[PDB]
Amino acid sequence: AVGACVLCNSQTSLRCGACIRRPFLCCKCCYDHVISTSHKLVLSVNPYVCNAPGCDVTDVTQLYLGGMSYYCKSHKPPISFPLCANGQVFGLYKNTCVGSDNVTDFNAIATCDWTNAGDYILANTCTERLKLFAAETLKATEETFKLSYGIATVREVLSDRELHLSWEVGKPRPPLNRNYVFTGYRVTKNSKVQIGEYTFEKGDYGDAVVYRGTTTYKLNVGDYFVLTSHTVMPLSAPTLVPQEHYVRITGLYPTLNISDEFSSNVANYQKVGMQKYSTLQGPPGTGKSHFAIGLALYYPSARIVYTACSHAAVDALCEKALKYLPIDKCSRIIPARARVECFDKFKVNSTLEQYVFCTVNALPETTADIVVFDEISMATNYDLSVVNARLRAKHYVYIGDPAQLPAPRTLLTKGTLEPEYFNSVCRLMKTIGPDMFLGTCRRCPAEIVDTVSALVYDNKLKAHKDKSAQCFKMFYKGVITHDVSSAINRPQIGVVREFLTRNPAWRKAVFISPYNSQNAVASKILGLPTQTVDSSQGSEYDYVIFTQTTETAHSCNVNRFNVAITRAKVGILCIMSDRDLYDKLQFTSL
Amino acid sequence: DRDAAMQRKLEKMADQAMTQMYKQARSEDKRAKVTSAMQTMLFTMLRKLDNDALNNIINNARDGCVPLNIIPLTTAAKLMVVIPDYNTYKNTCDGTTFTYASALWEIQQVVDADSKIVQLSEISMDNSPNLAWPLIVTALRA
Amino acid sequence: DRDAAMQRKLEKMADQAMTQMYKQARSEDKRAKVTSAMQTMLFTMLRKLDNDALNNIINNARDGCVPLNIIPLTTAAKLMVVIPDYNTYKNTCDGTTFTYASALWEIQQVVDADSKIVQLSEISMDNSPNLAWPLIVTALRA
Amino acid sequence: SKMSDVKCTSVVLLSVLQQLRVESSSKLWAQCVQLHNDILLAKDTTEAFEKMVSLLSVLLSMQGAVDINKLCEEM
Amino acid sequence: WDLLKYDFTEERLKLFDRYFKYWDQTYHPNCVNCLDDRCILHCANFNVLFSTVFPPTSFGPLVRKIFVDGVPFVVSTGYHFRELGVVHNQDVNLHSSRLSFKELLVYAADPAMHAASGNLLLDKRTTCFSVAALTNNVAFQTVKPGNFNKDFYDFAVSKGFFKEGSSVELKHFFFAQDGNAAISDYDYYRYNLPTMCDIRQLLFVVEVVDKYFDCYDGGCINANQVIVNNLDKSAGFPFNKWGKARLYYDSMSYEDQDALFAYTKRNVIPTITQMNLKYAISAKNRARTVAGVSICSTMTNRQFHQKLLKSIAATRGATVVIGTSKFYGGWHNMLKTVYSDVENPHLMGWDYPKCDRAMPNMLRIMASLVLARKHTTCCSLSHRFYRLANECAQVLSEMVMCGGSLYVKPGGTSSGDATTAYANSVFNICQAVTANVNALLSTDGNKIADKYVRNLQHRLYECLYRNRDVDTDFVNEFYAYLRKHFSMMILSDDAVVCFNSTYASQGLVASIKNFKSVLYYQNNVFMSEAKCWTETDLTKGPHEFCSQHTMLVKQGDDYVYLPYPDPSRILGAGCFVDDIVKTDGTLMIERFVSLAIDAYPLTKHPNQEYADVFHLYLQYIRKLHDELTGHMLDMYSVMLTNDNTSRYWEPEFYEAMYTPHT
Ligand SMILES: Nc1ncnc2c1ncn2[C@@H]1O[C@H](COP(=O)(O)OP(=O)(O)O)[C@@H](O)[C@H]1O
Ligand SMILES: [Mg+2]
Ligand SMILES: [Zn+2]
Ligand SMILES: [Zn+2]
Ligand SMILES: [Zn+2]
Ligand SMILES: [Zn+2]
Ligand SMILES: [Zn+2]
């Protein structure tokens, strides 16, 4: 099979071997990649190993081609020529080839391990194709490292159509994916070598699995299968569609006297109208999730697909459309997994309707007329590429605020990421500014919003409310037991145990904590509805019991504190341990 | 002479290798492109015809004036096409007549997205924004 | 040289016999699979049989032999009429019950050529052009 | 060469319509193949041309299966 | 009538004794009791009319509830033919224990299982009898249009082709069809009426046809001698669900293949045949259909007929030209074997309208009997009768599958069985001999100038309607007369005849009107003159044989006949391919080389733009090779050391194709 080079888009057939995603690579580009980095394996239509009965020389600059096979220096034929000569690697389309200087960033992209915080910076300023490749290999490396695998061995061979499986107890097990691979690990003495590449789909009877392998060797008794490497889908669409500026309204049909609430944003609906993609930035609780419904009721005859990376944002959008949009044809899309509960009050799973509600990983391959991507703060470049490849519409709407939380990025454990480096849309809205804006708080009271209007924003955000003076600030140890590598604080839930009996107006409160373990154990202790900082973004909460547990770089960030505190529409109790963060808040001091 | 002849055999065995190689690659090279690529062929070769009816029709399709059903060919048969702009109405509909596909049509419907029965006179310069765009026409062929 | 030249053709014939035996083994393994598939098909069609009416009509026979064309005519529990136009619909299965093959059938379902459900009130004289003929009505013995 | 030129355009247009699964709608596919077989058996320039217009109108009514704007600026 | 009644022997005897009471020949309602192959035809002729008063639901296979392994099957233990009467299987196993592959094959091939299991069907789209529908929804199958080769068409129009005022424009296209194609084409079997042929004349045309088929030899062959041309072809229903025919020729050894073949010689196996829509180029818009016979009938029919079928295809200079090439001067040899002792030559060729769907069942049974007259040593009489019954149960009138639904075939040949070209050739020779006999008898007699041929007509009448045994001397004399005055050349429906012009003008050999009358009263179709030609000049050959026009050219020092095809057909084949991989061109040079081979004789045609097609294809091959070499120079760095294509674009390779040396 042939393909296109990454950094020059020329026709080629030389895959690199030691790159994590197994991409297609050029001739001169591959020469520069394997002559400067530690990657030495290259996959042509046949692998570039030596063809001696016993020999392992997989480096390409090192072999010779004689006859029709690849031979080493010791096993070279009298008539041959080395593969890596004249600055290129031997492959198809030899002199129809052009190179570039994108290898200086390509080498660093393919060489890094994505635990640093500078490679993430590099993955967002270079050209578009290298951006896509960097995101793809980010997802691949994440799937390799985090939640890796459990060791599995085969007890006996029943047949070549159905296999036997035995998971090692003590570690979990990844399920079927043809995208997943279990590399053969007969590791004993005795050929600790790749014996093939396998995936496993299970049967409905007995202890059997009907596998799919890519090798023609029978299994040994000691052969193992531990999941190393994963193949994600090679998306093609760019992160952002190129901008085109319009003069009059195209593809959309405005309404006169639309309503009373959306009358302030009518000029906003035009400026959404005559641009290809428009961006909205605003502090939380200002109406970003309301502007989508405003667009819907300003452009009534056009289909709009409403989609977000998570389910909570699309469900809050469901709620707002439920109160403002016609109930009769509105939609909601759930995946075939159906793992979690969704907003099942419209038509569930009707892709042909005018208002489609969905989540980025489960969109159908259909058209649209306006697309409104909600909360790009949850969006990476992968999700943007997904929505660009699957949804094909005249207008794109990107609404969100970088001051709220970025994507999890569980590999990121060192350094700090700026809001403008979360994705491409954040880089747009923080560098050249958002197209249009609102800042005015109608959600949290004047006290707590005045606190947060110095930490993340420096006094550009006022409020229209009172200082209700139940933002209680408490400072205690909260002895931390480190059980599940997720923080549990029994004395913190204890001071909260006995500060709920004194407050009769806080029996409807909601428990918030940046650690999922203590978060979950708080259910039986005190019985309040219980949510984490990550999943509570979007919905409005009357009373909030926020409980900061530990002192670290994980729970002491101002951003997650911002979203956890700003969801209390009338009052909040905050538990704490820090002293730089306590020095700047304006709360009741206890 | 011996190794010269067996060298013949090596290059011809490579002829299998190369000819199989090219045929199989170009096989689903021809498969992967063709659908969108032969849509492009259809449009290039359609454009080569240069018939004013097809030109008029697909230049109206570009602006959004696409028909909602097949265009009938017998005299006095129903066609319904959506009007996306006042300029598009101004160019094609004059009086109660409707020129389209280089043919003459007279109006039965003008009707909007509200499905409200609408009559012919109010579509004018200063009354055009008052309309619920886009409008759907029903016409017969004269 | 003579002995080695003899052994070369020996290797050729050994490979040929090896290939023939390998092909024969694969043929045997395919024969077993097709035998299993045929057995399963036959036994499932046996499970589909309506044994009571079949036993009745076979016991009514003299030799035990009956024509095949009357087995569904007297034992099939579900009937399908394929209807090309509206007049034949009005002539053969008008209403919700009709009489064919000296029995009474009730219409449980009506589907068009696109396998879409058509309600029985949709089939009218004026509404015939809007239906994707032919219509496949499905009826059960009563 | 104006006459042997339409008769191939009908073939490619019907192939494109079959590509976009008009075949799953028996009613529409009826006059699609009807117009195709009638244009193949045509004698004058005219009826070939407005039967061409009628057959292309099937592709015209299709909002999302085609996107009309890409396939006609670069050509 | 009673539904369960299938034995109408008493009713047939009562009808015979009421109407044909003094017809003194013996009549057996069930043809299993017949004396020989001349008694099968006679009783079948009486039955084909006597079966038109009985209900159509009483025919078809005779099922019977058997029990295997304690589980109740329902299988066909016989057939009630409309022509051969009631036939019972000699080997029924009511209590079986183990089912071998032969038993699975038999019990899966027959329609008793599927029709018994399936739902009842009432199809108003056709007048043919409908039995059952297996699946719960009727399947509609369409035909895609062809795929345009724009490169070839652009190259053609850049060479001065496809204008107005052109004698060569595209006329063969790939016509598409809607979902009502297969069902509306199977409805054409309504043209097949139950036809009672004249029996005292058919029993002599049979002798004449057998004399035409006397040079060849045939018989039964073992399973290790049957050779198949292609193993990847389909195996009918229900065997297409599990694989192609290769699976059933590899899974079954020779022993259980001979066991099945010997089982069919004393048993009847009813068989389902699919109807497959063809995806091919044609000049008219109607859908053409071919009947896919399953493997259970095909293997046994091959073992029965292949010796004779491959003996016919290996003899040169005979009446039935099957196996004779049109290349290497084979067309010239056939066309000069046509002109063997004709007095005042004139050329004639007719056309059968709806040839494969309007044939009466009697003529097909006759063709199957004439093809089975070589088994006078290998087979007994009951074996031959049961083989004929199997042929009628698997070919002539059996259940037909049309889009997941089982119907009943009223008759005529299914055009996909093992013996279709040869049986059709027998049918064509029969129609020609019947036309000759009708022309000779219908002549006045007092106007007869030759005094011998008046005596020949007298003896013809007395051997038709006054004799009951064969008169081999007069049969030889009449066959010699026919080969002397009515020389023929048959390939299965196309005949070129070099009949005597003087005798035809006097009316002593068959003419066009005689064939029209014969097709009217023995085929139930009308033969119009509009598509049947007559050539009065022998120097230009027949007007059209096998869709190839022929003409006289000069090669070397003598003159030969070269068949040239319709250039519209060749240009349509080049322009309209049926696949995407055939559109690119550079992958397939064999397509255009074969087309240039087929269209080479156009260069010798007097009309210039007829001749320009060969040069168009040649320059196209030249450009195709040039751009293929360019592409393989861009996608590698090495240019092919032995690029052997140099002879494909110069006319020696195609000129040597029509020279009689090889
Ligand atoms: N112009 C307005 N007038 C009255 N209420 C408004 C207006 N705009 C927004 N709101 C209210 O403020 C809330 C904003 O919610 P949301 O859209 O989630 O804010 P954001 O998206 O900025 O976080 C809505 O529930 C809505 O009821
Ligand atoms: Mg919001
Ligand atoms: Zn690498
Ligand atoms: Zn490159
Ligand atoms: Zn080596
Ligand atoms: Zn008899
Ligand atoms: Zn025999």
Curated annotation (Swiss-Prot), chain E:
Activity control summary: Inhibited by Remdesivir antiviral drug (GS-5734) through non-obligate RNA chain termination.
Region annotated RdRp Palm C-ter, chain positions: 413-548
Region annotation (RdRp Fingers N-ter) ranges: 100-314
Region (RdRp Palm N-ter): 315-353
Region described as RdRp Fingers C-ter: 354-412
Region (Interaction with RMP Remdesivir): 278-288
Domain Nsp12 RNA-dependent RNA polymerase: 98-662
Residues binding Zn(2+) 10, per UniProt: C220, H375, C378, C379
Domain Nsp12 Interface: 1-97
Effect on the protein upon substituting R466A: Complete loss of RNA guanylyltransferase activity
Region (RdRp Thumb): 549-662
Cofactor: Mg(2+)
Impact noted for substituting P56L: In strain: Alpha/B.1.1.7, Beta/B.1.351, Gamma/P.1, Delta/B.1.617.2 Iota/B.1.526, Kappa/B.1.617.1, Lambda/C.7, Epsilon/B.1.427/B.1.429, Theta/P.3, Zeta/P.2, Mu/B.1.621, Omicron/BA.1, Omicron/BA.2, Omicron/BA.2.12.1, Omicron/BA.2.75, Omicron/BA.4, Omicron/BA.5, Omicron/BQ.1.1, Omicron/XBB.1.5, Omicron/EG.5.1
UniProt-annotated catalytic positions: S492, D493, D494
Outcome of mutating Y6H: In strain: Omicron/BQ.1.1
Residue numbers binding Zn(2+) 9: H28, C34, C39, C43
RdRp catalytic domain location: 345-507
Catalytic activity: RNA(n) + a ribonucleoside 5'-triphosphate = RNA(n+1) + diphosphate; a 5'-end diphospho-ribonucleoside in mRNA + GTP + H(+) = a 5'-end (5'-triphosphoguanosine)-ribonucleoside in mRNA + diphosphate
Subunit structure: Interacts with nsp7 and nsp8 to form the replication-transcription complex (RTC): nsp12, nsp7, two subunits of nsp8, and up to two subunits of nsp13. Interacts with nsp9.
Biological role stated in the UniProt entry: RNA-directed RNA polymerase that catalyzes the transcription of viral genomic and subgenomic RNAs. Acts in complex with nsp7 and nsp8 to transcribe both the minus and positive strands of genomic RNA. The kinase-like NiRAN domain of NSP12 attaches one or more nucleotides to the amino terminus of NSP9, forming a covalent RNA-protein intermediate that serves as transcription/replication primer.
The name this protein goes by in its record: RNA-directed RNA polymerase nsp12
Species name: Severe acute respiratory syndrome coronavirus 2
Name of the encoding gene: rep
Residues of the full protein shown: 4660 to 5321 of 7096
